[PDB]
Amino acid sequence: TTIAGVVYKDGIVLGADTRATEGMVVADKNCSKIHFISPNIYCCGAGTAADTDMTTQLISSNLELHSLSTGRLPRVVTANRMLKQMLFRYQGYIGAALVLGGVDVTGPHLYSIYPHGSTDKLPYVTMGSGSLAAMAVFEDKFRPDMEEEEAKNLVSEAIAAGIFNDLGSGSNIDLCVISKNKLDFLRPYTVPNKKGTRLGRYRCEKGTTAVLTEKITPLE
Amino acid sequence: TTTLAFKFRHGVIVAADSRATAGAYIASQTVKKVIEINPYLLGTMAGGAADCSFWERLLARQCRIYELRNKERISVAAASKLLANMVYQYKGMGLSMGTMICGWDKRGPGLYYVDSEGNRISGATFSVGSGSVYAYGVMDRGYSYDLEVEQAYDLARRAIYQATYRDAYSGGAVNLYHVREDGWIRVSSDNVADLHEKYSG
Amino acid sequence: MEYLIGIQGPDYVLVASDRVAASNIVQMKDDHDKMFKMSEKILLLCVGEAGDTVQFAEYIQKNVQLYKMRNGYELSPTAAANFTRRNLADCLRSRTPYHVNLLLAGYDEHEGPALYYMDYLAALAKAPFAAHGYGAFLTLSILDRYYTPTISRERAVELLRKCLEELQKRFILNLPTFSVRIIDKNGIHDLDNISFPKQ
Amino acid sequence: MEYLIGIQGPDYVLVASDRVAASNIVQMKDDHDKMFKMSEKILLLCVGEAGDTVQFAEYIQKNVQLYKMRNGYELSPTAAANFTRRNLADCLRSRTPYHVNLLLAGYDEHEGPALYYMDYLAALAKAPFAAHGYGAFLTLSILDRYYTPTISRERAVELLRKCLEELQKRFILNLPTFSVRIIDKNGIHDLDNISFPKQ
Amino acid sequence: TQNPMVTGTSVLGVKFEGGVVIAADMLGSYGSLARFRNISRIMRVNNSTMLGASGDYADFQYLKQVLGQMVIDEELLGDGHSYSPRAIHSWLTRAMYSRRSKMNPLWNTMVIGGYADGESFLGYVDMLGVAYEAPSLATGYGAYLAQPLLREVLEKQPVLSQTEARDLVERCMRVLYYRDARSYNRFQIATVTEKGVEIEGPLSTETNWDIAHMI
Amino acid sequence: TTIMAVQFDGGVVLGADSRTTTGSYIANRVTDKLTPIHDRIFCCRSGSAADTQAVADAVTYQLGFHSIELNEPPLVHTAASLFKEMCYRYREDLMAGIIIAGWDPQEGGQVYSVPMGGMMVRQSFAIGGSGSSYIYGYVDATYREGMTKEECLQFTANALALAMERDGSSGGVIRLAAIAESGVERQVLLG
Amino acid sequence: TTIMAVQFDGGVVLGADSRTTTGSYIANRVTDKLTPIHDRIFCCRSGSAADTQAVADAVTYQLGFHSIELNEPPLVHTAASLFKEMCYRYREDLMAGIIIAGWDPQEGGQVYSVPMGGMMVRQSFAIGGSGSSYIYGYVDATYREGMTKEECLQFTANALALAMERDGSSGGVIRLAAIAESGVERQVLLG
Amino acid sequence: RFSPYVFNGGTILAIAGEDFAIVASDTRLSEGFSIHTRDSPKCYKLTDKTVIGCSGFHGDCLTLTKIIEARLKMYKHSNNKAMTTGAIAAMLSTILYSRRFFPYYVYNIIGGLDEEGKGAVYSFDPVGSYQRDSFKAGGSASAMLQPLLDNQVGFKNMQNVEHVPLSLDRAMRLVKDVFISAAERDVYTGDALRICIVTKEGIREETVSLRKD
Amino acid sequence: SYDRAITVFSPDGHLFQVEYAQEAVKKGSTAVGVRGRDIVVLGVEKKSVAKLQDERTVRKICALDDNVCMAFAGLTADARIVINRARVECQSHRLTVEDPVTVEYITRYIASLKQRYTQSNGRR
Amino acid sequence: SIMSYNGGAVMAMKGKNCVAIAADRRFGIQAQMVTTDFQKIFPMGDRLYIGLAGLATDVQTVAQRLKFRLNLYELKEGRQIKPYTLMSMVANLLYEKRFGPYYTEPVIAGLDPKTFKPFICSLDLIGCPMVTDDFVVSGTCAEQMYGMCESLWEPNMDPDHLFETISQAMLNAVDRDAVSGMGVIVHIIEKDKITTRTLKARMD
């Protein structure tokens, strides 16, 4: 698991890989790790996969309730305050590492939330198991006020560093670009690893399997 | 793992399965659990597969040295006593071994049972393994001292079939030997899936 | 620790258990009864630790009797067995779980005889024959050796006879006596308290 | 776990044990022998764990036989029993201690019959009657109820008969058969292998 | 060694065209305390091989003593033979494995660089006796941080010049200064060539702190 | 991780490092440990990160509602008493090294220390955090009664520079804040 | 418990406290931790009391036999190498914080540090013991290159005075020793 | 404290033929969550007719290989001939048992030719028990490779399927496909596939790339 | 530890200490033994009684087991330690292979004990 | 472990306009079978099934709480449930026992009722849903089942070849497992009819 985010001159670029490993066996090859919160705020998740799902849906339900009452656009500091007040209440038993980012009225804002409830605003963050390989790309090649073509090229390079160097990572790279007026969510940004093609024909025909009892029930 | 052995009028019958597992994973289906010490002795494999393989190969070394010095073959009582003494020196260190020793002798048939803890007992019927208790029930029903040869083949063959049916760690094929006067003879080796169609109808 | 058996036929259910109430090394009572009626065609056979076998199984009995008084007719053996499974599974994730192993036997006028199997984790199993205790390891292999779906109740008793003689041959506990029931279209019937004279 | 008994009379020693070789839950052998000769008037009765009962007790046997070949005459029962106590106590504070419980029985031409008692800590005790196993808790109270120092060997057998019938009444293990010896001025004699027919 | 008292940290190493370059800092930590701030963690073995180490430092002085004797007694034979770098790598592998087998290990992790007979050598040696060869190595947290920066250059460009390699090490030493609590801003670079072994002085990094004004 | 507060006659001077570690990895390289509660009252926090952030927001909630109701700027001793009540009731669950400092119109600058136990004491200068053990000897000999403001900014800069150089858990950049009657002058310093 | 050694150009200056505790009781109130090995070579010991007394007598046995055989006054680096061999071979059984200092005719004054691991390094000034953690910041700022002898006696007196005041395990009276070419000047100091 | 073992991954595969023996393995060395190298095969050439594969703890795989290569020389200097394949398997069973109470954490498969030019595969446990088989798979992905070769080589669980023996050509593409399926679902299976083919004329080698996660 | 070769070869191929020991046998008292088809009979001669000594302590026919007797000649000091080592071996056979010792087996123990003892260091 | 107390194996596989699901038949306690007709696949309306594997209590418990919530849904609303909606229903049911969790792993397979499109998904024991397009597996012998399906699955398969693939995937993977076996039942559903077959497996 490798998630990362950055703040360029206009907005925020988020990125993640697509793999879920149960034990040491690859369970899912296309697990979507970037979630919806509001039409301007997304979040990336790491840690326990069921804990991040049920938490990112509860807060997204509450901001839909909150923004529809106030009649205006949500703010990123509100979603920060809802998360770190409920994670502290569950005393860290809910393992959910989150990268939060959005563009409200005040501008772009990027947060990183730890499963005990500690947060911090930063210009670039990495979480996950392969976070250390991705931080080395950000630490070497960051510059403030980049354009989004440099920002998309920087993040996709940093996610790819966690692909080829961490065992619990590595498939297609997702990205999302959030700006003041544009939301570009796109999952297959690049395909660095394919599957090799089969050589031998293993194909069996009908009648190579013994059947003891068959039943047919029609429907309509 | 399920082995059994019983002696009757016409020698000794030895039978075993062939499944060797690893946790819940099955390593192989074709493990020969009745190893051949001599042309006149047989030994089984129960518990640690490597510990039964080593110390009974080491026994076959020792019985051959006895024959060259004394110019006759060793008795079945003497052979198990050598195996009981070698294993005792490593008592408590964690050896897994539950084998049996079979063979014709000058006093007739011989069937002893040797543990890794130091048990050495005689007897007429034995059954060792994880599914050994499933083998005792069917074997005690059809056992007689005065069985025929083809009848005693069917008793030991079906008794392994009931043990592999209940136990999860027992299965594979059913190996079957027969210890006779001159020496042991390999009888057959049937798959359980073939016996399932045989014993059903 | 102690034993019972579940032979089920085409139109009957043959159940039997031991009669021994144990202690530390001695046996307190030699004519104990593990058999609990609920209706005129439903028995109950409970095995487990000390306090839970008596009180759970009579808690079921007061609810099956109450269903008949409130409605006039009895439960089916299927619904009776599937009501007990709810009561363990609810009380399992609790401060005081019951540790009992049981198998229920019943006859119905619609679907005929029925036998169910449970453990201390509340799993049901419609089985043609079953057994609990450590003697089940000895005695299941005789039973599927000789079982026929079309077996008569006269030779089912001598199948039970053979299945209990081997239990006094290669089993370290004593177990001298065995009480036998039979359930059919006419209800519960006592058979002979079969035993082996230790004199 | 398994049982033996030590009735000693005015001019005889009556010993008996069971015949059961056990396993996990099954019994491997029903005609086992716990009885080890060393001389023409000395027995040995060893109880304990698996490997130590066979190998320690025959280690004693090769030393008692060696004493007779080196000298021409045999050990007394007192010196034979007091030689075994040295061998446990030396091997007790070691890397491989033996865990066996035993009682030795012997007759001598000078001081007559003698019975000794030991445990897995090597304590001797000259006793008129003794027993090991969990059945010793059941059966010692019958034995001092009816013991007489001047007891004849004919009624000592029926005292042993009464002492074993109660062991198949309130004791959870099976124990069907019992092998009996008797030691007197003429040496070892086999008595009847008394048992209780479980058919 | 049951418990390492005074420890070191990550050691880097990468081949180039005709030689190997190795860098490591000059700090011996003690728990979370920086007691010894002027120690040297790189040993120059005779003329064509070269050793750095992490882990417990008192065990490193032991191997500095033993290898120091095995080179002295060979060269006064006049055989015309010296140890190749992979011969030392083979010796040091057996020394680790024969000592964990007695359940009394040497708490170290060592990188052996060398240039003999026209070709470069770079070998890894673990505490448990795990050894291999690679065109780039890193120990400690350097396997997590600096090692991905090494491989992405070497997969896009297999061979490197000497100036490209020495630049690429100083970038990775800067990264370990930011994101490691056991680092120190004073390191030294050792380099084998065909000319010999050269160990440069206490170099320092140049840090950037412009994001600290971002509230 | 290494926090420090020194008062002078007109007010107080605060200082802290910026390194936040997770075992041995640097999680946050630059960190603001100087948290505003009110306009003339700060705290600098140490110990557990998620614990001290949660307590500092609850005190800011309670003190802001307290001052708007009395219609009067709150006391420093009032704010220090609120941290004492939460750190003592929840002393079995919190690891907080809070130091409260700030200027007050009634008493001038005050500096209070609330360690992990839950006690509270006023000091002339306070010092806390993990790296604060290595500069106890320096801060005793160097401290002098009756400093100016410009000496206290020099005094806390040299003290944080020595602990950051010697401790492994401290490091980064030095954040300073001088609180007087006029306002708060914050600055980021290195060297 | 709190030991210190500083070299100057003509020689070295040693210093230590005198408190020996047993858990929390003061067993020995005055203690000589400055042990002579040879006429110009001392050591100051810390850690376990019975361990460091046994090692210091074995090195005195070996170094005295070594110097009488070569017929030459021994080296400081020679004596430091002997403590390294015993503290490394028996590192699983010893808790020793030995600092070896002294003057030598060939190289002047040397100061070596042998901590509990078993390593060895030469330093300009060494510092050890339990209470030595509280004066790391003082000894870094106050130290100045190229001192006289009379400044080093002042420098080690103020450093031991601060650790004794702040640590609970240190205390008592200050023992000093200056080793030069001429001889050894020991003195007992307080304040 | 100091644990003396670690798991370095790796996966080996051998197939006995009629006149051949194919031994293949990946080339990834890795412990924990990191990667040490992307080039470290397990094909070790003992003789011209015997290749051994060694998977498990890598520090033991380095030692056990060098112990074996010494004893093949000691046989030849004392018997004037090389060891056969069956003699190696009987020897290594005694070597593994010799450290019964501090075992090697190595899984071993010996492939090679017998005296009649037929394939032979001997699979070992870490204690030293063995048997002769037609195909075995050892290592991390052994639970994935063994069910596939029961279907294709063993012709198990099929009906009305003819029984043709495996050719050399069919066995090559059967090996190449089964590692591609194993590299997808296993995190340990590596990047290059070293395939060593033992025939009556020598040992051929072949390297096939995989995905590089 | 007295390490010296006692028994060495002669320049014509004899072992002098062996054949000097055969003359110590050649002046011990005579022992004769024949075997019948059902009962064996052996008996020493030259008891040489002095009518003031215990007749049982001077015996030279002893038993190794129930089935094995033994007579000897030569010097009696070395005899009764060969016997006491043979009694131990024929007893330890019973802890092994269960049958009693055959008469051929115990002579291979004595002769192999007697040979290697003309081969060791510092032993006549 | 806890999942290996009774064993079990459930596989679902997606075809062209059809979807098949298969499971084993063994019920047992750690070494010892009890019966060979234990139900693990339960119907949830027409053309939509669910398979459960894990602890044999929670197989029978969750399949009754889920049926409890399903009948109230299909009576309060006037329609049958979509396959995607049931996945959110089960994931709610497991996550309520976040700290008292049921030891089971469901597998859902069915056709979408309006546009007859297949759907497969699987969940862990606390409800992380994962939708795929080829196959999902659950049970003790999971790694054996990945080697089958990665090598045998094809993208567009008629219901004849879909049956042959999922049969050979189950008969070889379960045969390599020790605590799973004793028969395999295979359901293959489609928009016109539904087919249940039982395979001739090893009773060994």
Swiss-Prot record, chain B:
EC number, as in UniProt: 3.4.25.1
Consequence the record notes for mutating A50V: Displays high resistance to the bortezomib, a proteasome inhibitor of the chymotrypsin-like activity
This protein's GO CC annotations: centrosome; cytoplasm; cytosol; extracellular exosome; nucleoplasm; nucleus; proteasome complex; proteasome core complex
Entry's induction text: Down-regulated by IFNG/IFN-gamma (at protein level). Induced in breast cancer tissue. Up-regulated by sulforaphane in breast cancer cells.
Catalytic activity: Cleavage of peptide bonds with very broad specificity
Main location: cytoplasm
EC top class, as a word: hydrolase
Catalytic residues, chain numbering: T1
A GO MF label: threonine-type endopeptidase activity
Cytoplasm in keyword set: yes
Binding site for bortezomib: A49
Keywords from the UniProt entry: Cytoplasm, Host-virus interaction, Hydrolase, Nucleus, Protease, Proteasome, Threonine protease, Zymogen
Gene Ontology terms describing biological process: proteasome assembly; proteasome-mediated ubiquitin-dependent protein catabolic process; proteolysis; response to oxidative stress
Subcellular location per the Swiss-Prot or TrEMBL entry: Cytoplasm; Nucleus
Assembly description: The 26S proteasome consists of a 20S proteasome core and two 19S regulatory subunits. The 20S proteasome core is a barrel-shaped complex made of 28 subunits that are arranged in four stacked rings. The two outer rings are each formed by seven alpha subunits, and the two inner rings are formed by seven beta subunits. The proteolytic activity is exerted by three beta-subunits PSMB5, PSMB6 and PSMB7. Directly interacts with POMP. Interacts with ABCB1 and TAP1.
Family, per entry: Belongs to the peptidase T1B family.
From Swiss-Prot, chains C, D:
Subcellular location as annotated: Cytoplasm; Nucleus
Disulfide bonds: none
Positions carrying N-acetylmethionine: M1
Keyword Cytoplasm assigned: yes
CDD domains listed in its UniProt record: proteasome_beta_type_2
Domain of life: Eukaryota
Record Gene3D superfamilies: Glutamine Phosphoribosylpyrophosphate, subunit 1, domain 1
GO BP, sorted A to Z: proteasome-mediated ubiquitin-dependent protein catabolic process
Chief location: cytoplasm
SUPFAM superfamilies xref list: N-terminal nucleophile aminohydrolases (Ntn hydrolases)
The keyword Nucleus belongs to this UniProt entry's keyword annotation: yes
Gene Ontology CC, one term: proteasome core complex, beta-subunit complex
Coiled coil region boundaries: none
Keywords noted in UniProt: Acetylation, Cytoplasm, Host-virus interaction, Nucleus, Proteasome
Induction section of the entry: Up-regulated in ovarian cancer cell lines.
Similarity field: Belongs to the peptidase T1B family.
Assembly and oligomerization: The 26S proteasome consists of a 20S proteasome core and two 19S regulatory subunits. The 20S proteasome core is a barrel-shaped complex made of 28 subunits that are arranged in four stacked rings. The two outer rings are each formed by seven alpha subunits, and the two inner rings are formed by seven beta subunits. The proteolytic activity is exerted by three beta-subunits PSMB5, PSMB6 and PSMB7. (Microbial infection) Interacts with HIV-1 protein Tat.
Protein name (record): Proteasome subunit beta type-2
Species name: Homo sapiens (Human)
Gene this protein is translated from: PSMB2
Curated annotation (Swiss-Prot), chain I:
Source superkingdom: Eukaryota
Keyword Glycoprotein attached: yes
Organism: Homo sapiens
The protein's name in its UniProt record: Proteasome subunit alpha type-7
Protein task: Component of the 20S core proteasome complex involved in the proteolytic degradation of most intracellular proteins. This complex plays numerous essential roles within the cell by associating with different regulatory particles. Associated with two 19S regulatory particles, forms the 26S proteasome and thus participates in the ATP-dependent degradation of ubiquitinated proteins.
Full protein segment contained here: 2 to 125 of 248
Family classification: Belongs to the peptidase T1A family.
Keywords: Acetylation, Cytoplasm, Glycoprotein, Host-virus interaction, Nucleus, Phosphoprotein, Proteasome
Location of this chain's protein in the cell: Cytoplasm; Nucleus
Record bears the keyword Phosphoprotein: yes
GO MF term list: identical protein binding
Sequence intervals crossing the membrane: none
Curated annotation (Swiss-Prot), chain J:
Record's note on what induces expression: Up-regulated in asthenozoospermic sperm.
Lineage, top ranks: Eukaryota, Metazoa, Chordata, Craniata, Vertebrata
PANTHER family associated with the record: METALLOPROTEASE TLDD, PROTEASOME SUBUNIT BETA TYPE-3
Gene Ontology terms: biological process: proteasome-mediated ubiquitin-dependent protein catabolic process
Listed GO CC annotations: cytoplasm; cytosol; extracellular exosome; nucleoplasm; nucleus; proteasome complex; proteasome core complex; proteasome core complex, beta-subunit complex
Native source species: Homo sapiens
CDD domains hit by this protein: proteasome_beta_type_3 (cd03759)
Keywords: Acetylation, Cytoplasm, Host-virus interaction, Nucleus, Proteasome
Positions of post-translational N6-acetyllysine modification: K76
Key word Transferase present: no
Positions where N-acetylserine occurs in the chain: S1
Protein name per UniProt: Proteasome subunit beta type-3
Signal peptide start-end: none
PROSITE patterns, per the entry: PROTEASOME_BETA_1, PROTEASOME_BETA_2
UniProt keyword annotation of Zinc present: no
Short name of one Pfam family: Proteasome
Primary localization: cytoplasm
Subunit structure, as described in the record: The 26S proteasome consists of a 20S proteasome core and two 19S regulatory subunits. The 20S proteasome core is a barrel-shaped complex made of 28 subunits that are arranged in four stacked rings. The two outer rings are each formed by seven alpha subunits, and the two inner rings are formed by seven beta subunits. The proteolytic activity is exerted by three beta-subunits PSMB5, PSMB6 and PSMB7.
Similarity comment text for this entry: Belongs to the peptidase T1B family.
